[PDB]
Design a protein around this ligand. Sequence first.
Ligand SMILES: O=C(O)[C@@H](CO)OP(=O)(O)O
Ligand SMILES: O=C(O)[C@@H](CO)OP(=O)(O)O
Ligand SMILES: [Mg+2]
Ligand SMILES: [Mg+2]
Lengths: 439, 438
Amino acid sequence: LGSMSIQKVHAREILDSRGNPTIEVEITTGKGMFRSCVPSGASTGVHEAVELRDGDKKRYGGKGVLKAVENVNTIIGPALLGKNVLNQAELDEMMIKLDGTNNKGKLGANAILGCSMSICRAAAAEKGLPLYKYLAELTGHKEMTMPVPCFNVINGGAHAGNALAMQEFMICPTGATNFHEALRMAAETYQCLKVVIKAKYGQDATNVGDEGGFAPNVSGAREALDLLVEAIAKAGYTGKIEIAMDCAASEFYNEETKKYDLGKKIPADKKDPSLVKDVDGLIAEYVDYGKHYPIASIEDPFAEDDWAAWNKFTVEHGNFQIVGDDLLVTNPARVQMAMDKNACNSVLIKVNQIGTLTETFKTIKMAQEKGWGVMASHRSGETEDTFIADLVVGLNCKQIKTGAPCRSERLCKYNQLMRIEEELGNIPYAGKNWRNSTA
Amino acid sequence: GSMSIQKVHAREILDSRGNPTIEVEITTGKGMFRSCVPSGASTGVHEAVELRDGDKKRYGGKGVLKAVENVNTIIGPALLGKNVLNQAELDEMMIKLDGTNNKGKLGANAILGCSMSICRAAAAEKGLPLYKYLAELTGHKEMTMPVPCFNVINGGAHAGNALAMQEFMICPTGATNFHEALRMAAETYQCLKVVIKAKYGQDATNVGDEGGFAPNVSGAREALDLLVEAIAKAGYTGKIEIAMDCAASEFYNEETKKYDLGKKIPADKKDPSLVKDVDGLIAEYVDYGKHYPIASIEDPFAEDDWAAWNKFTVEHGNFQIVGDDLLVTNPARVQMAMDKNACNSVLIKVNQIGTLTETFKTIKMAQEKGWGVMASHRSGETEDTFIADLVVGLNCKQIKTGAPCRSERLCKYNQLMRIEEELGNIPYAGKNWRNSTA
Ligand SMILES: O=C(O)[C@@H](CO)OP(=O)(O)O
Ligand SMILES: O=C(O)[C@@H](CO)OP(=O)(O)O
Ligand SMILES: [Mg+2]
Ligand SMILES: [Mg+2]
């Protein structure tokens, strides 16, 4: 019983970037108090660990987290008092067993994750290390790299009234030489995009979505991609910025007919029937985009359980980074399935989707051992917490998507990444290297 | 000793709009204290000016590498070894080091970052939370949780709609504590979002710089109707009031002395009565007030239309009339308003003056006159929560720091909740906005 021992655990309800309640957890040791805030997704894969919400329709539209907070204060916290914060896997497993359900739906994945993260922060202080460095040592990473940031810039799918099927288009400065330059390139390109959008779609078209990007009324993906090429060109960075696409294809998939409708939002009398695609037709569409635009990466190109489609795309078009999101939900068992089936070559990491840091590390290890890409990710409902910045560096993931360069729940991560780079001095930048290893 | 400045270091970060700003770290025996500075003006006639690089090829000329260099190589060395507890002495030292009235040599941004981090280091030296240290420093024996006022609808230069005014805010003056105030506003905002989607479409729920919506309304009445509807849907009629920021300088014609409430309306669709003289404008404001629960009006007239401000304040002595552009957090402008009886409330934007010491003085002047005092965000904010501790410790009783949306806004509201939780019994301002010396 010493400085490393938990003396106090306390949670409270705060508001996330969308203005909905979420939880923050504070853990106190001899090194001080350590705070973590938990994010939350606007739309969530059917397989995620589950956040506990109050369901009281008279309070915050039923989205309160008083129950999760009490769970921390009167259940998890009491069980953590006196324990050693250095024992990350032991404490995470203890909370998993308290809950007793595979989806963490009893105590709430949000309650558990908040404790998991603050335990980790307290431990880094105990070792006298910055968080990213503690994360590296905890996970056996002898090398660290600044990740390529991918910035949401144009929205579609369920997030916009435009005709655009895909959920988002991102810009990724793979050609930058360091992180502060990468951020500057994206910020400049984002401002050029804002100008182009204002001129073409009007002032109000530059108001922003949840993640800081724009939702102009484009006719489809080609018009959206043209806008990105135009902005990158105005910024002067052609050939140094690439494009990532998140299709979120489950959103426009018809399980019964096996069809993907790229015109779901288009009025019948204006709807090209060619927009309703079978897998081969959807594949050809993606390949066409790839031929005409610098698209490096495609996330959720097919529905969350269309394994055959994922496999075909992966072995027949492996030149793309192919990212499982809704497919994998940061869940090691899903990752194992995807590896056996050879269904993708990259995984998105959303910590709150699995609910503990220990399980997150395992997901990342599996991916890195296979040489898959690993992209740390924000949620639509973010907070002023910067944890994932340290996580992406410490675990050497090499990619992060955490928002447009707009809205501070996004900038706070990018600012932290710049600090980490400044502090390290001679840390390399990932550039066009996305595939991971366990080194 | 642990009070002595051992290290001063600044770097360039991005603000909530994606533009560069500065953050400053000061290290003492108590640890490292970081402050982020919100973005402000680099030009203008009365306010302190931030320093920008003006390199067109970098961040569109908006870099702050020069301000950063000023902190690291000029202000920092002048601070080394100094006692953080001496706020006024250090602020005055920096003011003299810059040597210009508007801090334009070193930059108000460079100076303020230092001022704030000195203050945080001092609070730690005294073993106090920031808000409490601030109260002690400024002689406030009583603290109050402020009424938060939240941006909800945008007009003027911030929207393509016909709405003349820059923004409407909602203010939960009928809440009983701060946690409840925030919830009321969050619920109302979500209700408004639903209403706007139904009436104007999904894309009309995308948000502006401060988290509010820009629905294509025809004018003030349509906007006010949406707010009253949202408030009723949330179930808080009579407990939420409306603040109107006209930013009237935006639609003032200096040659004709007219205020055009239809600047954005095409000539052939335009009601001719929309172009008003001062009396006509006053009449319009009075009419909104008769039909809607409007509790305050910010910049109702142009930034130098003293006669109009005085006329309005005299004819409505009891009603909150807030100076923003009129005053720019500037003690000399505040004094002029007091001499002319031009208004009865002041916005406080710390970066518009540049040091905490001068900020304390502007607030003190207003409190001695029984004026309203409203701590305010900037359009380009950061993840820094300083103004939350500031508004509580200085007993200002009002704060406007965004819609309940975008974390550069929520981080302040979240911090305000923490302060209330920590204090326990602290009163909520409610309908009491006029400050006092108590
Ligand atoms: O959908 C996504 O990929 C991400 C944000 O880019 O998260 P979310 O689930 O919360 O929307
Ligand atoms: O326009 C304004 O009146 C205010 C509102 O926050 O500030 P700024 O200059 O930051 O825009
Ligand atoms: Mg996705
Ligand atoms: Mg204003």
